[PDB]
Amino acid sequence: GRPEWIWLALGTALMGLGTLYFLVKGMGVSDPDAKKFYAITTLVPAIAFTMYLSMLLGYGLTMVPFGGEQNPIYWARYADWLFTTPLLLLDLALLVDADQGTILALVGADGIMIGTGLVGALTKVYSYRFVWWAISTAAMLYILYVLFFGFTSKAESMRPEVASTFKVLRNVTVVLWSAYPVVWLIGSEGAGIVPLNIETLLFMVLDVSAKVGFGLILLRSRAIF
C-alpha cells in the first residue's frame, strides 16, 4: 500500500543514479559544445528524479471519478514530461542544427501533447478522456514525423558520426514515445485493463530508457564534441 511504490522507488534510484553520473562526467568536460549537451541531458533525469520522489512519498496523486469508480491518477508524471520532453527534443535539434521555427513548432506541439494528455487524465466523462488522448497522440505523431523525415534530412548534411548518433537516438525515441499512448490507453487512465502497479512498472521502464538510456547513448558519443 500503495502497491506501485516498489517501481516508484526503483525509478527514483535509477533517475538519481543517472543524474549523478551525468553530472560527474559533465563537470569534467572542457569542450563548450559538449557542455550544452551535458547540461540539457543532466536536467532530464534530475526533473524525473524530483517527480518520482514526490510520487513515492505520496504527492501528485488525485482521484478522478469516471466509469462509476474513483480512479487514482498520478498527475505529477505530466509536470515531469512537460519539461523533460522538450529538453530531449532540444538535444536532438541541437545535434542536427534544426532551425528556430522547427524547434518552436516541436516544443509547441510537445506542450499540446502533454497538456491535452493531462486534461484527458482528469476528465470525468469517460468518453471525452479518449477525445483528449486522440488530440495528444496526433500532436505526438506530428513530432515523430518531423524527427523522422525532417531531422534525418538535416542530419545527413552533418559528418557521418553525427548522423549515425542521430539515427540511433531518433530510433530509440520513435520506439519509446510510441508506446506511451498505448500504456495510457490500456492502463488506469483509459480502459483500465492493466492495473496501476503493472502500468507504473511500464512507465518506469519507458522513462528510464527514454531519459537515462537516451543520455548514455548521446553523452558517450563523439558527436557532441
Ligand X SMILES: *C/C=C(C)/C=C/C=C(C)/C=C/C1=C(C)CCCC1(C)C
Ligand Y SMILES: CCC[C@@H](C)[C@H]1CC[C@H]2[C@@H]3[C@H](O)C[C@@H]4C[C@H](O)CC[C@]4(C)[C@H]3C[C@H](O)[C@]12C
Q: Which burial class, exposed, middle or buried, applies to 153 when counting CB atoms under 10 A from its CB (0-12, 13-18, 19+)?
A: exposed
CA-to-CA separations, 46 to 97, 104, 155, in angstroms, rounded: 25, 23, 28
Q: Of 46, 55, 82, 88, which one interacts with ligand X (CB under 6 A)?
A: 88
Contact indicator for 171, 165 with CB cutoff of 8 Å: no
The separation between CA 167 and the C-alpha centre of its own chain, rounded to angstroms, equals 18
Task: Specify the stretch interacting with ligand X by CB under 6 A; choose among 8-16, 83-91, 149-157, 164-172.
Answer: 83-91
Distances, alpha carbon 166 to alpha carbons 43, 129, 148, 156, in Å:
20, 35, 10, 9
Q: Which is nearer to ligand D10, 5 or 142 (CB)?
A: 142
Q: In the complex, what is the shortest distance from the CB of residue 74 to ligand CCCCCCCCCCCC, in angstroms, rounded to a whole number?
A: 17
Q: Which of 58, 145, 195, 225 binds ligand R16 (CB under 6 A)?
A: 145
Question: Which of 221, 209, 223, 177 has its CA nearest to residue 18?
Answer: 209
| Backbone phi, psi, residue 161, to 5° | -60, -40
Among 2, 9, 150, 213, binds ligand R16 (CB under 6 A): 9
CB of 13 to ligand Y, least distance (A): 12
What residues from 1 to 20 belong to the interface with ligand Y (CB under 6 A)?
5
Segment 1 to 20, residues that bind ligand CCCCCCCCCCCC, using CB under 6 A: 19
Is 109 one of the binding residues for ligand CCCCCCCCCCCC (CB under 6 A)?
yes
The residue among 39 and 175 lying less far from ligand CCCCCCCCCCCC, judged by its C-beta, is 39
Cell (9 digits) for 210: 527514454
C-alpha cell read off for 49? 528524479
Rounded Cα–Cα distance for residues 150 and 89 (Å) = 13
Q: Which span sits near ligand CCCCCCCCC by CB under 6 A: 80-88, 99-107, 172-180, 189-197?
A: 99-107
Buried b (16+ CB within 10 A) or exposed e, 158-167: beeebbebbe
Pick the stretch among 63-71, 97-105, 157-165, 180-188 that binds ligand X (CB under 6 A). 180-188
Per CB under 6 A, which of residues 40..99 are in contact with ligand CCCCCCCCCCCC?
A: 42-43, 46
Indicate whether 107 belongs to the interface with ligand CCCCCCCCCCCC (CB under 6 A): no
Contact residues for ligand R16 (CB under 6 A)?
Answer: 9-10, 12-13, 141, 144-145, 148, 174
